[PDB]
Design a protein around this ligand. Structure first.
Ligand SMILES: CC(=O)N[C@@H]1[C@@H](O)[C@H](O)[C@@H](CO)O[C@H]1O
Ligand SMILES: CC(=O)N[C@@H]1[C@@H](O)[C@H](O)[C@@H](CO)O[C@H]1O
Ligand SMILES: [Zn+2]
Length: 277
């Protein structure tokens, strides 16, 4: 059992209840510190692309700790090298947000928390045949982090919810765990075009929920996409699972981890990318 809000099973306890691997020293999230990071001009623009002959349905579930969009197999991919040859295949996208607008993200950028951080989770299909083979194996995963920020004046079509197609209206108080519903597909290419896909932090870290496996290649884009207060409050209408002390889902984020805890046996480095100038 784990939770965010029950002090007994909360994130401070994960290093004990899930020693493998929540006690490790390559954990996530971290503070993404622009001044400490190393600019690496070899890190290219990220591309997200779709298999246009895929027809299966997309679904979303309230799994008790987030809203998680589950994509069909063989449908959405990420390329980090400009070639569209299916090296990373997207599995799911879920979200982390706050009870209030000034927190919610798991990563910080120079100490700053955003209201909502989305995680697009993919597996390295280049090496592994399926999500379930990759999820617990070395180097199996790569996650994209997308920061969202609230604006007062904006057309719907300009907000991230256009790419999400409003999650087909499923974000409301009656979307109780562990219900899942079919939704219109998420246009992840459009979502990525709402920010600068060349401008990101990059490091090796972990899943941010138990068992915190250290096999995640992280990419966190620096520019946020935009949403309204109305849209953030939609997520806040979801109920938490019954493991949680709080009724309404919010503050479902793990606290910050150090880039290099004192016990590390080989330091990791935080890299940054920017467009070819
Ligand atoms: C995964 C991939 O590269 N391509 C897939 C293909 O294997 C599948 O038969 C087709 C129809 O759904 O969708 C496309
Ligand atoms: C196509 C679709 O479902 N999108 C709707 C959009 O038409 C509407 O104007 C807005 C209302 O908040 O939210 C969403
Ligand atoms: Zn996440």
């Amino acid at each position: 059992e784990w939770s965010y809000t029950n002090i007994l099973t909360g994130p401070e306890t994960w290093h004990e209840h899930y020693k493998n691997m929540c006690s490790g020293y390559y954990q996530s999230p971290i503070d993404l510190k622009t001044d400490i990071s190393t600019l690496d001009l070899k890190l290219k623009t990220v591309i997200i692309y779709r298999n246009t002959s895929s027809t299966e349905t997309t679904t979303i579930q309230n799994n008790g700790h987030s809203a998680e969009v589950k994509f069909p197999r063989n449908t959405w991919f990420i390329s980090f090298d400009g070639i569209l040859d299916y090296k990373y295949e997207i599995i799911q996208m879920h979200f982390h947000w706050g009870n209030t607008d000034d927190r919610g993200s798991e990563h910080t950028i120079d100490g700053f928390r955003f209201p909502l951080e989305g995680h697009i989770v993919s597996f390295r299909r280049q090496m592994y045949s399926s999500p379930s083979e990759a999820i617990g194996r070395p180097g199996g995963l790569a996650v994209l982090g997308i920061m969202h920020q609230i604006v007062e004046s904006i057309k719907y079509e300009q907000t991230a919810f256009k790419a999400y197609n409003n999650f087909s209206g499923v974000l409301n108080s009656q979307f109780v765990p562990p219900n899942n519903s079919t939704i219109d597909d998420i246009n992840l290419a459009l979502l990525l075009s709402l920010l600068n896909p060349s401008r990101y932090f990059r490091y090796l870290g972990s899943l941010t929920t138990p068992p915190c496996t250290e096999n995640v290649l992280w990419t966190v884009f620096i520019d946020p996409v935009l949403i309204t207060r109305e849209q953030i409050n939609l997520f806040r209408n979801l109920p938490y699972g019954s493991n949680e002390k709080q009724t309404r889902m919010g503050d479902n984020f793990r606290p910050i981890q150090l880039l290099n805890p004192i016990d590390t046996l080989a330091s990791r480095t935080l890299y940054r990318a920017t467009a070819r100038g």
